[PDB]
Design a protein around this ligand. Structure first.
Ligand SMILES: *c1ccc([N+](=O)[O-])cc1C(=O)Nc1ccccc1OCc1ccccc1
Lengths: 263, 10
């Protein structure tokens, strides 16, 4: 039936996700549980470890400032990656380019949180494409306002990872977030919602098939989607604060584009 | 929104 078309949309989206995003949830878990004949990552738990492990850090000033800069570098690349994936969602590019922009602008932080969760466990986060592991206790222990920047993302991820979604689920879930017809300032809501409807059905079918064990994973996952909005509001604000209070720190242009007229 | 515009046009 239509199931066939929905299945095919899921597989298109999975493949596009695989191309768009460098580190899959699958690999990240493998790393995180040592289930790989590949040396574990360089654990960064204090200032010493960070010094010893700054050679390993991906980045191309005090510690807290430097960590946030490294965290900011990777954020920009995530937006480049989410943007590429968005382009591949059937009929996203056919939308009005002003809406394409609106969707992404509100979408990315919700998806960044989603992505981070793939890279997190209760105690820390994978960094530098799984080559480093920065601890939660360490990030928490940073001076304010920086110490409380990642902790909300950790808090969401322990809850979100309980759902044990895989990459194939995540691909569709991400698409659903991007194509939200209820974003402030959309010019033409109707074709957005038409795609989202296809996507949501694709998602429901994926979740039923991939997890017959778990019923109302779909309902549970939709409830997370609504939390994540208000969780992203806190993050937006804390950044606007950090922009003003920390004069030494330059914030990346692309990032700034996304904080303009956000809440 | 130039960067975003540009990322979208590539
Ligand atoms: C970190 C700092 C600032 C911002 N920001 O200004 O929006 C974002 C991030 C961030 O979201 N980082 C991030 C997002 C998605 C995937 C990976 C990410 O980096 C995690 C990280 C890297 C290096 C040090 C600490 C955390």
């Amino acid at each position: 039936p239509e199931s066939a078309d929905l299945r095919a949309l899921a597989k298109h989206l999975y493949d596009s996700y695989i191309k768009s995003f460098p580190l899959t949830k699958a690999k990240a878990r493998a790393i995180l549980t040592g289930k790989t004949t590949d040396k574990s990552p360089f654990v960064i738990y204090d200032m010493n470890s960070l010094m010893m492990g700054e050679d390993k850090i991906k980045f191309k000033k005090e510690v807290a400032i430097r960590i946030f800069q490294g965290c900011q570098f990777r954020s920009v690349e995530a937006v480049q990656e989410i943007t590429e994936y968005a382009k591949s969602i059937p009929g996203f590019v056919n939308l009005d380019l002003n809406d394409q922009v609106t969707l992404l602008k509100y979408g990315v932080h919700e998806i960044i949180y989603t992505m981070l969760a793939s890279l997190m466990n209760k105690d820390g986060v994978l960094i530098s494409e799984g080559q480093g592991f920065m601890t939660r206790e360490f990030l928490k222990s940073l001076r304010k306002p920086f110490g409380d920047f990642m902790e909300p993302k950790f808090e969401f991820a322990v809850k979100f990872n309980a759902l044990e979604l895989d990459d194939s689920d995540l691909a569709i879930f991400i698409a659903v977030i991007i194509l939200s017809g209820d974003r402030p300032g959309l010019l033409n809501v109707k074709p957005i919602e038409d795609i989202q409807d296809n996507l949501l059905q694709a998602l429901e079918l994926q979740l039923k098939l991939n997890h017959p064990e778990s019923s109302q994973l779909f309902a549970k996952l939709l409830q997370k989607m609504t939390d994540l909005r208000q969780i992203v509001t806190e993050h937006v604000q804390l950044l606007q604060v950090i922009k003003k209070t920390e004069t030494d720190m330059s914030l990346h242009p692309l990032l700034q584009e996304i904080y303009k007229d956000l809440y | 929104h130039k960067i975003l515009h540009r990322l979208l046009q590539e």
